[PDB]
From Swiss-Prot, chains A, B:
MBT repeats lie at residues 1-101, 109-208, 217-312. Homodimer. Interacts with RB1/RB (when monomethylated at 'Lys-860'). Interacts with p53/TP53 (when monomethylated at 'Lys-382'). Interacts with CBX3, ETV6, KMT5A and VCP/p97. The L3MBTL1 locus is imprinted. Paternal inherited gene is expressed, while the maternal inherited gene is silenced. It is found in: Nucleus. The MBT repeat 2 specifically recognizes and binds monomethylated and dimethylated proteins. In contrast, it does not bind trimethylated proteins. The MBT repeat 1 does not bind methylated peptides but inserts a proline ring in a Pro-Ser-Ser/Thr sequence context. Changing D150A: Abolishes binding to monomethylated and dimethylated peptides. Changing D254N: Does not affect binding to monomethylated and dimethylated peptides. Changing F67A: Does not affect binding to monomethylated and dimethylated peptides. This is Lethal(3)malignant brain tumor-like protein 1. It comes from Homo sapiens.
Length: 315, 315
């Protein structure tokens, strides 16, 4: 199977490499992660929370991570240039809480004693693109307030806080709601707005969960009572629309089976999202995804990185 | 104590009779209701439901009603010209459900057997202003849909239905919410609007409780699925604002002890409501009330109807 003959046969084109972020397109970096290496990382189910993880599997420029002490059914895949993993020791140098292995209490864990018990190696620091050493997202400080879209209830723009800052990204948290609504963001995110944006648009602002008298909700009073500042208006950057067009082909991680990467086409587009179709599969498997998601890639990505590519499903 | 004497010490004025509805002002009708007379009436705490009620007390042009079979702690006062009471036998001739006395099954209650058991008399029909013999509210039929303010959550305007029609009034019900939010209305009510009013106002509409995918609520889809039509826009009338002014004196039922009527003053106003202050009492007892409410009356009303009036609280 080749992309060249496939595109010739389909009279189609791939999405040019120039439409991707460098982190999505880069194939010339070696994967330095090795089986058994230990590290810290974000739980994709609880994006505010950090766990001790072990490398369970490597495939191309991707790794499968295991939560030490828990079931292997929680394992998940990342790219080796993921900014959501960090070297052993990072949590204590940068102000982050680390969930210990199942069994430990969080004043009974140290890395030096845990590496001694397990005889394991921490992944070396030079492997990690994000160690809190890069310039921060200008203007967004921990504790500052903004208006954010709830991506699980996307018709709602809500009162939200910056609760974590790591390199050029920050965590959006919805005041008084479960942390499982949190998501990582940057200054150009189309989902975040300055305090006062809703009122300027004649849009309903959703106040914190069970705010007393939500009808009389007023930002100025809320900021005063919480000892908080608004993220300043100048910090918010216009992200321009992506340039993907319908029928352009690419490679995408299968969401039902994330060990696998399949030949995919752009089925539909919005300003900041694309709809993925897996060639040869039912359209029931189509899904919408952010154009900057780390799990879509230009054609050739699996081949240059050493990951198997699934061809179109054919007879 | 007299009004003439009091008005002179306060250098004050009474709200003129022409500011009130005729039904709030009328003093020359006699109270024909008698202790122990039985009738049917709306439960004020469940405005959609009808119960068997007994006259427990009469004071001037007011009567206290007791729910047969239930605790006296639920007793309530109405005026003798109330539209919310009907003669025995009305429910069956008009398509309404009667809740029987506590402990009876509905089906095993009949008025004639119940009058025989209690040896009581039904209040005669000529006492009742509302027997369902008058023209209906034009344009409002059972089953028609409209938008209504939820008076318990007054920032919300919601999908609502006409569920009952009695003489000149109709009952507004909030689709898929419980019946305790229902309220009685006429065509001039400030709280109701035609289908599509929110949209034209750039105001959000609250769809029925747990409507599947509530952001796409489409009135015309909803009207079709429910086999329903909109109340026509022509049927909604403008109510002009009241002309009560701050400082006018009047008489009002005490909401904490509703057997009592006190000298009151208008503390504040809106287009359709006044704020009542009880002379000589703490302002912590001030309350808002709709200006057409049956429990406010002009100065002189207690005197002319034979009801005791409480003078201002003094040292």
């Amino acid at each position: 199977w080749s992309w060249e003959s496939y595109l010739e046969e389909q009279k189609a084109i791939t999405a040019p490499v120039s439409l991707f972020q460098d982190s999505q397109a880069v194939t010339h970096n070696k994967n330095g992660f090795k089986l058994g290496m230990k590290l810290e990382g974000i739980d994709p189910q609880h994006p505010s929370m950090y766990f001790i993880l072990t490398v369970a599997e490597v495939c191309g420029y991707r790794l499968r991570l295991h939560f030490d002490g828990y079931s292997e059914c929680h394992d998940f895949w990342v790219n080796a240039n993921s900014p959501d993993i960090h070297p052993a020791g990072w949590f204590e140098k940068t102000g982050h809480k680390l969930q210990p292995p199942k069994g430990y209490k969080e004043e009974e864990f140290s890395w030096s004693q845990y590496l001694r018990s397990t005889r394991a190696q921490a992944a070396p620091k030079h492997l990690f693109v994000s160690q809190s050493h890069s310039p921060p997202p200008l203007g967004f400080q921990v504790g500052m307030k903004l208006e954010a879209v709830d991506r699980m209830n996307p018709s709602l723009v809500c009162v939200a806080s910056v609760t974590d800052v790591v390199d050029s990204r920050f965590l959006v948290h919805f005041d008084n709601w479960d942390d499982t609504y949190d998501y990582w963001c940057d200054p150009s995110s189309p989902y975040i707005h300055p305090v006062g944006w809703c009122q300027k648009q004649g849009k309903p602002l959703t106040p914190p969960q069970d705010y007393p008298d939500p009808d009389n909700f007023c930002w100025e009073k809320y900021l005063e009572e919480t000892g908080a500042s608004a993220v300043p208006t100048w910090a918010f950057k216009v992200r321009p629309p992506h340039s993907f067009l319908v029928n352009m082909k690419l490679e995408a991680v299968d969401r039902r089976n994330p060990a696998l990467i399949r030949v995919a086409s752009v089925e539909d587009v919005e300003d900041h999202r694309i709809k993925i179709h897996f060639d040869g599969w039912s359209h029931g498997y189509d899904f919408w995804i952010d154009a900057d998601h780390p799990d879509i890639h230009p054609a050739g990505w699996c081949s240059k990185t050493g990951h198997p590519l699934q061809p179109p499903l054919g007879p």
